[PDB]
Specification:
The structure is a homotetramer of 23-residue chains.
Chain A lengths: L1 H21 L1
């Protein structure tokens, strides 16, 4: 369960990084 | 470009973590 | 500021993954 | 072993994000 939650958190961070890159 | 590549790398790690969790 | 915060989060996740691996 | 390696990668990514933020 913690591994899956971390994976979700990494997916979310990835989205944030893509928004940062585009801005 | 580095931000987007890191995002890809995080997405890949997330997949790896989900496989690790399931195993 | 966002990047520095993300970096902090990734470092904490790494710490947690190591603890998970240690048992 | 995989988890420890992922942790290492996330730590390097964090280092790089901080450098990107520093200019």
């Amino acid at each position: 369960g913690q591994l899956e939650e971390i994976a979700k958190q990494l997916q979310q961070i990835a989205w944030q990084l893509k928004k940062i890159a585009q801005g």
